[PDB]
Amino acid sequence: TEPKWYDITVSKAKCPEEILRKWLDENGERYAYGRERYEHFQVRVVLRNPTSWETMREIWGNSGHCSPTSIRNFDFVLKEGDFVCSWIKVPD
Ligand SMILES: [Mn+2]
Ligand code: NA
Ligand code: NA
């Protein structure tokens, strides 16, 4: 089965946040991302559909660098910072 869990490092200069967010909403069942400085979005996503790594590499091109992940959690958002999550938190 092709992977569903991917980490992606997305270049903001090549992919504005709103384009990334729309793609994540359309293609991810669950996702979260942070920002690290050229600013990059550091994404983890579980895709709705199994998708080959080669497909992911082609559709992101040099705008993002992706890799299937064996990690199965979004707990990086528990650290300090401003993160975007696909689900609703208590203060949202
Ligand atoms: Mn969604
Ligand atoms: Na958080
Ligand atoms: Na949230």
Author numbering: 2 to 38, 43 to 97
Article passage:
Replication initiator proteins (Reps) from the HUH endonuclease family process specific single-stranded DNA sequences to initiate rolling-circle replication in viruses. Smacoviridae is a family of small CRESS-DNA (circular Rep-encoding single-stranded DNA) viruses. Named after a triad of residues, the HUH motif in the nickase domain is most often made up of two histidines separated by a bulky hydrophobic residue (U), but can also be histidine–U–glutamine.
The structure of the human smacovirus 1 Rep domain was obtained at 1.33 Å resolution and represents an expansion of the HUH endonuclease superfamily, allowing greater diversity in bioconjugation-tag applications. To uncover structural differences compared with other ssDNA-bound HUH-tags, attempts to co-crystallize the ssDNA-bound protein were performed by mutating the catalytic tyrosine (Tyr81) to a phenylalanine. The crystal belonged to space group P211. There was one protein molecule in the asymmetric unit. The catalytically dead phenylalanine substituting for the reactive tyrosine residue resides within α3 and the coordinating histidine and glutamine residues reside within β3. Another difference among the families compared here is in the orientation of the HUH/Q and tyrosine residues in the catalytic motifs, but this could also be explained by the absence of the divalent metal ion that is required to prime the active site for nucleophilic attack on the DNA substrate.
